[PDB]
Design a protein around this ligand. Structure first.
Ligand SMILES: Oc1cc(O)c2ccccc2c1
Length: 398
């Protein structure tokens, strides 16, 4: 049935084994300081994972996993405190960024938005504090703005915390283009350092916002229209900001954020020059046959429990039964209207969201843009990253 083919019916070897996950993927990813260990150091993680493997802790959702990371984070914060006092601001920033990655992995894969007393929420709260302190020392610092949700209705929260970073020379006389990052299930606003570096290096502003049913997003996760109101608030705030040119704006949806990039490309087409959807779902990812096997593929841990809560469902059974008809951009007809330019990027052999969720968008609305990587899993890294920046350079060209 699925383009994924033989791999669909496979149980991936790291399933329920943090040992195999580490030894076969995460150890290498950590060494290279690439996702999910970007900004991070193997010297910080190897002792923690050796501890987790020795105690045979495989459930990332459990407190035993989360709390294994916190003493390392503490020691890094003290090393940073020492570095700062000695006037070593670059070292202190790096140590705090390293602490942020330790907190990030500790709260993998999902901070439960309904359980604010959870250790993973506490980990995320400490990560944000570490990260803001680290980035306050940058020549172009990341600044948090709490955007009032003026377009809030129903069960929407009041406040939209976003990260903004502006390149050197950005002012009312010379306002700069905007790349608006929409983050994912396991990546929130502090998890995008290198993306902000690249955006600023091309003379653009970086704005980072979390998606409904994650992190500090106030959008009603149960209301499919909640993202539309969320972006009405964010885009209205950016319109007012004198140094940011909203006439040259692109949205960048990462993984779970890809759904929201695709949706926004239709709902807000007249306010966007373009949208990138990186490893997106929009329809077939909520197919019960797909959700039956999604836990058996490349995602480091169980995903269906996190997905249930992120889609505003109290139970996984209720999620599998109801999600597609409610949230599908195809089923609901969101795709049957025009869109701004939309670049779809993924691995052909994505076992997290199906490649069919890129391909189906070519059978609706405006012409779409795509590059899909043969034999590559979810996100189609590393190939899919540099093409992202090539496309932004074209769309935002002077
Ligand atoms: O921002 C992201 C999010 C992901 O889920 C990724 C997965 C694999 C490789 C890079 C990623 C980057």
């Amino acid at each position: 049935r699925w383009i994924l083919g033989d791999k669909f019916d496979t149980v991936f070897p790291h399933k329920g084994s943090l040992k195999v996950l580490w030894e076969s993927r995460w150890k290498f990813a950590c060494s290279k300081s690439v996702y999910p260990f970007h900004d991070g150091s193997i010297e910080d993680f190897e002792p923690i994972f050796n501890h987790l493997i020795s105690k045979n802790i495989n459930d990332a959702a459990s407190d035993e996993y989360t709390q294994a990371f916190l003493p390392t984070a503490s020691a890094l914060e003290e090393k940073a405190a020492q570095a700062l006092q000695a006037g070593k601001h670059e070292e202190a920033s790096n140590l705090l960024c390293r602490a942020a990655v330790v907190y990030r992995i500790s709260r993998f894969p999902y901070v439960d938005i309904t359980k604010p007393n959870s250790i993973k929420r506490v980990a995320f709260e400490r990560q944000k504090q570490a990260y803001l302190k680290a980035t306050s020392l940058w020549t172009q610092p990341i600044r948090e703005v709490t955007v009032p949700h003026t377009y809030r209705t129903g069960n929407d929260g009041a406040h939209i915390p976003i990260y903004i970073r502006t390149p050197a020379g950005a002012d009312q006389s010379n306002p700069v283009p905007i790349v608006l990052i929409m983050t994912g299930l396991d990546g929130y606003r502090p998890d995008n350092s290198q993306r902000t570096h690249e955006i600023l290096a091309r003379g653009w502003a970086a704005v980072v916002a979390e998606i409904p049913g994650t992190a500090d997003c106030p959008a009603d996760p149960a209301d499919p229209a909640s993202p539309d109101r969320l972006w009405d608030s964010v885009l209205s705030y950016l319109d007012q900001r004198p140094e940011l040119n909203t006439a040259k704006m692109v949205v960048w949806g990462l993984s779970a954020g890809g759904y929201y990039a695709i949706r926004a490309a239709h709902t807000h087409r007249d306010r966007l020059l373009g949208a990138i959807a990186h490893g997106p779902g929009c329809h077939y990812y909520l197919d019960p046959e797909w959700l039956a096997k999604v836990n058996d593929h490349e995602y480091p841990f169980e995903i269906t429990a996190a997905w249930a809560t992120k889609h505003g469902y109290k139970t996984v059974e209720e999620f599998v039964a109801g999600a597609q008809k409610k949230f599908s951009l195809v089923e609901t007809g969101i795709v049957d209207q025009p869109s701004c330019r939309l670049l779809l990027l993924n691995g052909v052999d994505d076992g997290v969201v199906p490649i069919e969720d890129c391909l189906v968008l070519f059978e609706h609305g405006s012409p779409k843009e795509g590059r899909f990587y043969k034999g590559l899993p979810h996100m189609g890294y590393p190939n899919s990253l540099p093409v992202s920046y090539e496309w932004l350079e074209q769309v935002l060209a002077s």
